[PDB]
Amino acid sequence: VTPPPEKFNFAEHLLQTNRVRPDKTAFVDDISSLSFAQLEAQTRQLAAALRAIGVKREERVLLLMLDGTDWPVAFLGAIYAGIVPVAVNTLLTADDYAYMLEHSRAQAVLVSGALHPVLKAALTKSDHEVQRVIVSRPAAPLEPGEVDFAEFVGAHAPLEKPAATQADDPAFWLYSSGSTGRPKGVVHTHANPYWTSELYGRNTLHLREDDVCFSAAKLFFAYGLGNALTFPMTVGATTLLMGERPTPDAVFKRWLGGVGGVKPTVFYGAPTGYAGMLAAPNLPSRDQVALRLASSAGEALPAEIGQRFQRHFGLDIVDGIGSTEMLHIFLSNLPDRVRYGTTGWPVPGYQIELRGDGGGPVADGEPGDLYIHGPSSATMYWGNRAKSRDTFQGGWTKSGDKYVRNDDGSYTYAGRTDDMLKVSGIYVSPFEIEATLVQHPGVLEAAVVGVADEHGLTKPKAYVVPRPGQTLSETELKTFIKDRLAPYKYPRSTVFVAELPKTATGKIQRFKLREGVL
Amino acid sequence: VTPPPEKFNFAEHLLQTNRVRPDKTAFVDDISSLSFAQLEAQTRQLAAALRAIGVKREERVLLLMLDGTDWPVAFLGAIYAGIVPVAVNTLLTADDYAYMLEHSRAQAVLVSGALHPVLKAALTKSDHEVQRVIVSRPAAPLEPGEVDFAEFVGAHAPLEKPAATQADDPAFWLYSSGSTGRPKGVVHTHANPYWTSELYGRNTLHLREDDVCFSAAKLFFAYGLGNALTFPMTVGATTLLMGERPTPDAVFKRWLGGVGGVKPTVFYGAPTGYAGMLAAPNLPSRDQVALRLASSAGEALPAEIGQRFQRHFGLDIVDGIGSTEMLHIFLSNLPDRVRYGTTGWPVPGYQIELRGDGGGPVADGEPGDLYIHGPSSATMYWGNRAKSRDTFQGGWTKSGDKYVRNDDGSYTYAGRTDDMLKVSGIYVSPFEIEATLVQHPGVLEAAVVGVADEHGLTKPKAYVVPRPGQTLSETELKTFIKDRLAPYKYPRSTVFVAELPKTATGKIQRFKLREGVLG
Ligand SMILES: O=C(O)c1cccs1
Ligand SMILES: O=C(O)c1cccs1
Ligand SMILES: O=C(O)c1cccs1
Ligand SMILES: O=C(O)c1cccs1
């Protein structure tokens, strides 16, 4: 792969790539479509619009939007102007967003109508710097000074040239959370998505122009950003976008060509989703679908899920691992080489190391902490020097995963170096779930660990000590957690216990909980 | 009143004052009591204990505690050490505390057991700097880094000398909410509570050594911090503290001598509480209480409430106004000169100005914006230069209130400059409540305004447009707010309407709602 030039604007790169195919569909959702020419026009009008309201090069904007055709316009339009979009999860709380507004110093917000209420609450509570709120598909009347995204774009002529950025200039942020503390601002450059799109999208997956890409993983997830924006636009593929929650039925409707007159050829999702679809009574048959490639990431793929999928569809699931910090997948199975029970082989262009308790070598077949050296790594966590130092160890990025290397050079997942759980693509802190449980007045103490479900997939499991003299039912506890946590975070079961295993200092021995002591 | 000396430590001042009465009760609550000598010992031991865990002069600690005897030990022990306690409301959310930990850079937290769950959530999610958590009356097993408050105090000998602070050095913080944006860290000096306690506690209320003080307003409130800490310690009075919510029965129990073998002589609380008490069937008779003085602040007092209290008790309610920023009351009725319908007269030592649209003066009988010049003003809002320069303008502090001066020199409340609601003593933003209601999936739009209840006291009232094809209930939405915000921010009723009145700009015509056009 040839490196990108030193003067490089990622948005202009993707627009230029597709000037050969102006009338091919770039993006389609339930209600709209953009050809590559339409996307280019709207991208550059948006870029002009942000500049016209006073947003300057290198300033951030918050991009808080459901998957739909306006999403890439927002993302690429900011980048075309040399403005840094901060693309965030759509299922967070107003407090989460208020922290992000302050921390990013966002100068504007691009937000879906459905998300305006949570955004409004974040604006009201925070010491933000937001100059304008631009609302895609408003679901309620606009407040004074807010503007509809379509009018905002339509009112400005296209910016005539992109910002003259460098390849190693910040281009966009994602946020990633650890087991405690506020989300961390992962800063990616203009070069980083070129690298993931070339090394993985083109050279590992072999995506091509006649593909139709559809990702259950949303655009704000590193995984989804690649799958359904950077990868397809790199090769000229058409992309299907879906705003709603990805259930089996929602996915199957698109698989069957229910939207935009297109059937996906490439699908991407989490192992949990694949398990859910294989369980579904109305799982489509091989002849109803046009899938040629199924990608998975976000948690280890249990072998039985890949084997079942292969037996039913005659397609393997290609399981890989990436991170927010590395932007996309650096260790993967290949379309024509899949070894179930492993995450495959290092992606060419990425170097992988396993380190022991002192940073030393580990013998094949022994677990080590996984570190990655490759060209898509983020530069830092913005404004967090101590966490940056821990993660970005001079050229090597520490994943937080443990792995074992096998005789054939493949790698098998061996757990985490923190206490995070990966519950269907999404990191979940057990300490967060515990913090929520102990605010129920009937709970004295709580401990949350990961447990494998009937398919081998990790879900939280809560051990709760009830407070003497209060009552507390399991149904009571379910209701309590329902609107306080997002559903992926729901414990799969709660066990009421008389006490928890602890050291003399009162630290909970969570390892004893995973070992079954209760 | 003599100014304090340049070298001045407020805690040391209060301890020194009471070296003449070591065995008199300083503080008593439902389970414990402290004489002045025992308070001094505990205060200085706590001071040493904070130093021993590495907290330095000028660093903050969060004080998140229910009213009881440990509260003044925590507050004065920090100040004795030259450490700055940040005294906060006990009814807030985890998100609320997360922000205060971050913004204060608190190095330790002193917390009541009952508030440990909410603090734990705040510590988990925040980028805080807390090294140790000291837990007063733990209600669950201690975690690593946590220590029982009595064990912590008991583990250290008294600090020999207080920190050598200056009168104008920061001594403590309180947080003040605004209509939008984060709550503001109000910085008070060592001198500030000396001035309030001399100018108001002694010289206006005439508190004396033989009083027993009892405030329904908790210690974290600027009002209660004077009432039940700085005021009584200044004169050697005994103070009754209560952890629980101040309902009429709880208050009456204490008025009657149900706790500590002491009947309060001096009561303090919001007009809301006085209305609740006067409406109560079990309201005590005169001959059952020892009350000699009844103070009110936190909202304007309806004349009818003071008049009924006086008819029943032969005591007036003495209404005054203070602010977090001015630390205590600067405009007040006097114990023997009360004019109901007014907040009385300037407190000697404070100058008061009303200013109209141009910054100029206003005629008597017309409203103006209230500004105060007095010696207890906070210095700034920590880390907020813009709001500091807007509030603290060369010796004048802007209250955000409007008032009218009457012909007799008394002052009558005329509303706010910023749409804040003052609900039972607590400033509440209607915009916070609204932005929260709109997250309800059945709500299309919502506006919240302040409406008088049946006693004339302002409560939030919500006007909601439901989403077409949804039916909502009042109580559902009360719950929805209690589950997300501090609980007393809940709208007392919700009116469901088809549309909100708006300007041509799409701005909500809040004045129409408040004026009752839609009911
Ligand atoms: O495995 C994962 O979580 C990811 C794959 C690509 C970006 S993140
Ligand atoms: O399938 C999904 O929704 C996801 C996989 C990785 C992040 S989200
Ligand atoms: O609860 C009360 O009575 C009050 C709190 C603050 C002023 S009065
Ligand atoms: O009136 C009030 O809110 C206050 C009285 C003394 C401090 S604050």
Strand order in the sheet with B443-452: B443-452, B458-466, B493-496
* Resolution of this entry, Å: 1.7
Instruction: Give the contacts of B36 (CB within 8 A, at least 6 positions apart).
Output: B18, B19, B21, B22, B23, B24, B25, B26, B236
Binding residues of B for AMP, as ranges, are 298, 319-320, 324, 401, 416, 422
Amino acid letter, B65: M
State whether B435 and A483 contact (CB < 8 Å): no
- Write the DSSP assignment of B309-374 as a string of letters: HHHHHS--EEEEEE-TTT-SEEEE-BTTB--TTS--EEPTT-EEEEE-TTS----TTS-EEEEEE-
The total of structural domains in chain B comes to: 4
Task: Give the Cα separation of B76 and B36 in Å (integer).
Answer: 13
> Which structural domain, as residue segments, surrounds residue A453?
429-518
Candidate from B221, B245, B296, B329 with most ligand 3 atoms within 8 A of CB, to mutate = B221
Q: What CATH number does the domain containing B54 carry?
A: 3.40.50.980
Chain A residues within 8 angstroms (CB to CB) of chain B: 93-95, 117-118, 120-121, 123-127, 140-144, 180-182, 429, 431-432, 434-436, 438-439, 444-445, 467, 483-484, 502-503, 505-507
8-state DSSP, B27: E
- Write the DSSP assignment of B165-234 as a string of letters: -BTTSEEEEEEE--SSSS-EEEEEESHHHHHHIIIIIITTT---TT-EEEESS-TTSHHHHIIIIIHHHH
CB B93 within 8 A of CB B99: no
Indicate whether B263 and B398 sit together in one domain.
no
Half-sphere exposure of B142 (CA within 13 A, CB side): 18
Q: Indicate the SS3 state at residue B30.
A: coil
Task: Give the Cα separation of B24 and B480 in Å (integer).
Answer: 48
Indicate whether B178 and B219 sit together in one domain.
yes
Q: What CATH number does the domain containing B500 carry?
A: 3.30.300.30
Q: Closest-lying ligand to the alpha carbon of B270?
A: 3
Instruction: Please tell me which of the candidates B124, B180, B443 has its beta carbon nearest to residue A124.
Output: B180
Q: What CATH number does the domain containing B306 carry?
A: 3.40.50.12820
Beta bridge partners of residue B135, listed in sequence order: B111, B148
CB A123 within 8 A of CB A130: yes
Task: Give the Cα separation of A188 and A169 in Å (integer).
Answer: 8
How many other C-beta atoms are found inside a 10 Å radius of the C-beta of residue A385? 9
What is the enclosing helix (H) or strand (E) of B414?
strand B411-416
User: A445 contacts in B (CB within 8 Å)?
Assistant: 140-141
**C-alpha of residue B350 to centroid of ligand 3, in Å:** 23
Write down the H helix ranges in A227-270.
231-235, 248-255
Indicate whether A438 and A420 sit together in one domain.
no
Question: Exposed/middle/buried for B336, CB within 10 Å: 0-12, 13-18, 19+?
Answer: exposed
Indicate whether B395 and B508 sit together in one domain.
no
Q: Indicate the SS3 state at residue A231.
A: helix
Indicate whether A77 and A226 sit together in one domain.
yes
Domain boundary among B296, B316, B336: B316
**C-alpha of residue B425 to centroid of ligand 3, in Å:** 5
User: A428 contacts in B (CB within 8 Å)?
Assistant: none
State whether B182 and A438 contact (CB < 8 Å): no
Instruction: Give the contacts of B244 (CB within 8 A, at least 6 positions apart).
Output: B250
In degrees and rounded to multiples of 5, residue A321 shows phi and psi of -120, 135
Sign, Cα dihedral of A13, A14, A17, A23: negative
8-state DSSP, B284: P
According to the 3-state scheme, what is the secondary structure of A98-156? HHHHHHHCCCEEEEEHHHHHHHHHHHHHCCCCCCEEEEECCCCCCCCCCEEHHHHHHCC
Nearest CA, atom 3, ligand 1: A298
Task: Give the Cα separation of A288 and A252 in Å (integer).
Answer: 10
Nearest CA, atom 7, ligand 2: A425
State whether B142 and A445 contact (CB < 8 Å): no
Task: Give the Cα separation of A55 and A47 in Å (integer).
Answer: 10
CA separation, residue A6 to residues A76, A165, A405, B467 (Å): 19, 9, 36, 52
Task: Give the Cα separation of B371 and B355 in Å (integer).
Answer: 8
**C-alpha of residue A483 to centroid of ligand 1, in Å:** 27
Task: Give the Cα separation of A267 and A252 in Å (integer).
Answer: 11
Task: Give the Cα separation of A223 and A426 in Å (integer).
Answer: 11
Write down the H helix ranges in A146-302.
149-154, 191-196, 222-225, 231-235, 248-255, 271-278
- Residue B420 in contact with ligand 3 by CB distance below 6 A: no
Angle between helices B70-80 and B10-17 (to 10 degrees): 120
- Residue A425 in contact with ligand 2 by CB distance below 6 A: yes
Tokens of B480: 């929805």
User: A432 contacts in B (CB within 8 Å)?
Assistant: 124-125
Strand order in the sheet with A132-136: A147-148, A132-136, A108-112, A60-64, A84-87, A170-176, A184-189
Q: Closest-lying ligand to the alpha carbon of B227?
A: 4
Residue A254 assigned ligand-binding role: no
CB B237 within 8 A of CB B211: yes
- Residue B111 in contact with ligand 3 by CB distance below 6 A: no
Q: How many interchain CB pairs under 8 A, A with B?
A: 91
Chain B residues within 8 angstroms (CB to CB) of chain A: 94-95, 98, 117-118, 120-121, 123-127, 140-144, 146, 180-182, 384, 429, 431-432, 434-436, 438-440, 443-445, 483, 505-507
Instruction: Give the contacts of B76 (CB within 8 A, at least 6 positions apart).
Output: B11, B14, B15, B39, B43
Indicate whether A36 and A59 sit together in one domain.
yes
Angle between helices B248-255 and B271-278 (to 10 degrees): 80
Question: Exposed/middle/buried for A60, CB within 10 Å: 0-12, 13-18, 19+?
Answer: buried
- Residue A274 in contact with ligand 2 by CB distance below 6 A: no
**C-alpha of residue B396 to centroid of ligand 3, in Å:** 25
CA separation, residue A201 to residues A2, A90, A293 (Å): 15, 25, 12
Indicate whether B383 and B329 sit together in one domain.
yes
Nearest CA, atom 5, ligand 4: B322
8-state DSSP, A281: T
Instruction: Give the contacts of B239 (CB within 8 A, at least 6 positions apart).
Output: B26, B27, B28, B212, B213, B214, B228, B229, B232, B233
Task: Give the Cα separation of B319 and B340 in Å (integer).
Answer: 8
Q: Determine the residue of chain B that is closest to A146 in CA distance.
A: B506
Q: Determine the residue of chain A that is closest to B500 in CA distance.
A: A141
Residue A416 assigned ligand-binding role: yes
State whether A180 and B124 contact (CB < 8 Å): yes
Residue A67 assigned ligand-binding role: no
Solving technique: X-ray
CB A54 within 8 A of CB A131: yes
Tokens of A113: 């109508």
Helices (H) and strands (E) in chain A, counts: 16, 26
**C-alpha of residue B320 to centroid of ligand 4, in Å:** 8
- Residue A368 in contact with ligand 2 by CB distance below 6 A: no
Q: What CATH number does the domain containing A404 carry?
A: 2.30.38.10
Q: Among residues A17, A66, A75, which one has the least CA distance to residue A43?
A: A75
Domain boundary among B428, B447, B474: B428
Task: Give the Cα separation of A295 and A221 in Å (integer).
Answer: 15
State whether B124 and A431 contact (CB < 8 Å): yes
Indicate whether B311 and B455 sit together in one domain.
no
What is the enclosing helix (H) or strand (E) of A437?
helix A430-437
Write down the H helix ranges in A303-351.
303-313
What is the enclosing helix (H) or strand (E) of B443?
strand B443-452
Task: Give the Cα separation of A506 and B144 in Å (integer).
Answer: 6
Indicate whether B400 and B347 sit together in one domain.
yes
Indicate whether B201 and B323 sit together in one domain.
no
8-state DSSP, B47: H
Nearest CA, atom 6, ligand 2: A425
Domain boundary among B396, B428, B460: B428
Indicate whether A306 and A341 sit together in one domain.
no
CA B164 to chain centre: 28
Q: Closest-lying ligand to the alpha carbon of A424?
A: 2
With a Cβ cut-off of 6 Å, ligand 1 is lined by: A 222-223, 297-298, 321-324, 328-329
Question: Exposed/middle/buried for A36, CB within 10 Å: 0-12, 13-18, 19+?
Answer: buried
What is the enclosing helix (H) or strand (E) of A42?
helix A36-52
Nearest CA, atom 2, ligand 2: A217
**How far off is chain B from A509, nearest CA to CA, in Å?**
12
Indicate whether A329 and A194 sit together in one domain.
no
Task: Give the Cα separation of A23 and B274 in Å (integer).
Answer: 74
CA separation, residue B271 to residues A228, B25, B201, B217, B342 (Å): 60, 29, 19, 11, 13
In degrees and rounded to multiples of 5, residue B64 shows phi and psi of -120, 80
Q: Among residues A235, A248, A312, A308, which one has the least CA distance to residue A281?
A: A248
**C-alpha of residue A206 to centroid of ligand 2, in Å:** 21
Task: Give the Cα separation of A162 and A166 in Å (integer).
Answer: 12
Q: Indicate the SS3 state at residue B417.
A: coil
Q: Among residues B508, B484, B95, which one has the least CA distance to residue A126?
A: B95
Tokens of B498: 């088809």
Task: Give the Cα separation of A272 and A281 in Å (integer).
Answer: 16
